[PDB]
Structures are given as structure tokens and as C-alpha cells.
Amino acid sequence: HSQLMAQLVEVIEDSFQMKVNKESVNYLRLIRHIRFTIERIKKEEPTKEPEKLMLLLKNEYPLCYNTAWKLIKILQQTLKKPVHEAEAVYLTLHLIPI
Amino acid sequence: QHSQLMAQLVEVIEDSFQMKVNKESVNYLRLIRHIRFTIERIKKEEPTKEPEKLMLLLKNEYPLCYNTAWKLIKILQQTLKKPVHEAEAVYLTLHLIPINQ
16 A cells, blocks of 8 residues: 555645654554554454553653553552553643643 | 642652643643542542543644544545544554654
């Protein structure tokens, strides 16, 4: 899907008004994710909703991810209630901009 | 309140990122609002509809990456001629975020 991948890349460059770093880990990862999503779509297999997101966030933003978990550690120690993993995902996403 | 708890969460954030949060800024306010909601869901022991919640979060907080992901998803659907699920837009947004920055 050479022309398809090129077109997807162009939409991203136009939209974000940047040129991709084709050297970078983030880019290499994106193209691999797109190639794999193509296959899942062809096969009509479901997306993994949950624990997949966690690994992704850990790899893309280790510092925000681990920061989320230190927050959650303090919350558990204080409030004593269990913490559903989905909470580390939301916090990681709220921390990235800071 | 959870005032001291909040204060302690913010120090930890400041120290992790090697920064000072301007406590008279919109991003100090945004941050603590999201954090109080986390506390409330933990204390009250409430689960979230995770695909549903992420889509809402991303739309509000990463609107450029989210909207661009939806455009890509529609291209894939039209080219491959297959259904695409909502979860794709989410996982694709998360790969774009580090790209836009």
C-alpha cells in the first residue's frame, strides 16, 4: 500500500504543518501501527480496548506514564481503595502537556 | 478539599518534570480539576467506559490529533472497503500525539 501510506503521511503533514522525521522512533512506530491496523481491518478482528493502551503510553511517554503511577501510588496509600488501571491512562494524558 | 493530598501530588509532578507550575495559570487549574475527578472516581469506587472516556478526553484535550486521526480512519475505511471501529481512532490518536508534539 505504497501510495496509500504516502497519502496518509501527506494528510498528517498538511494538518500538523510539519515534515515527519522519517528517522525517528515515533515515526517508525506510527508506520508500523498503520501497517498492522490495515491487517486487522482486512480481517475484521477487534481492537484490544484496554491493556494495549498502557504499553503504548509507557513506550511513548515513559516519564508521564511513571509520574501517573507515582500519583496513583500516593492515592492508594492515602485513600486505600483499589485503582483501576484506566486511571493511569487518563492521568498520563492529562500530564503530557504540562 | 483533599488539600494537602492535592499539594503533595503537585510537588511530585513538579519534581518529576523538573519544573515550577504557575499556580496562577490555566494549566494549574486544568490539572487539579482532572486530578480531583480521579480522586472522586477512586473514593466513590466508580469504573469508566474506557473507550468511551478516551474518545471524550482526546476530543477535548488533543483536538487536532483526534480530528486528524478520524480523517485517516475514513481514508482507510474508504480504501479498504471494510468497517473500522472507534477504538482505531483512539490508538491512532495516541501515535500522532508525539508527532504533533
